[PDB]
Design a protein around this nucleic acid. Structure first.
Ligand SMILES: N=C(N)c1ccc(OCc2cccc(COc3ccc(C(=N)N)cc3)n2)cc1
Length: 91
DNA sequence: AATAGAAGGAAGTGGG
DNA sequence: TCCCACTTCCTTCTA
């Protein structure tokens, strides 16, 4: 099963949910969620994982925060904005 | 207050 | 056994 950071990177590459997520500075790996359309993206994550309950953005962001230590994804001090690591981007 | 973003401890679930 | 990689629940805190 796909890892969350890869799910997000793949969405950004394909462009299939451009109203819910977008690059801010793609060279730096910074990206941002839509305030109004993030929940539809969270729902898609939960359905792709086959989880028991409906996925929410809050729960998806709780998972994102766990990457802070290992570094795959870090929180940017901007509303709804995060940053992929160079290692994640290279793959 | 209402709305909403952000944090994180802790317990539960998956698939090795 | 026991870590992976989250998921779920709840409370707190900040803007
Ligand atoms: N578990 C703890 N003890 C804990 C410790 C620290 C915490 O801090 C939370 C926090 C940190 C930084 C920034 C923010 C809020 O940011 C916002 C940005 C933009 C908007 C907007 N324009 N609508 C609204 C809010 N909230 C929370 C709980």
């Amino acid at each position: 099963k796909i890892r969350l950071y890869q799910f997000l990177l793949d969405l950004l590459r394909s462009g299939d949910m451009k109203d819910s997520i977008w690059w801010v500075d793609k060279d730096k790996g910074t990206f941002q969620f839509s305030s109004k359309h993030k929940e539809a993206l969270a729902h898609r994550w939960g359905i792709q994982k086959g989880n028991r309950k409906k996925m929410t953005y809050q729960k998806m962001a709780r998972a994102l925060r766990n990457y802070g230590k290992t570094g795959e994804v870090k929180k940017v001090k901007k509303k709804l904005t995060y940053q992929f690591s160079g290692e994640v981007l290279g793959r």
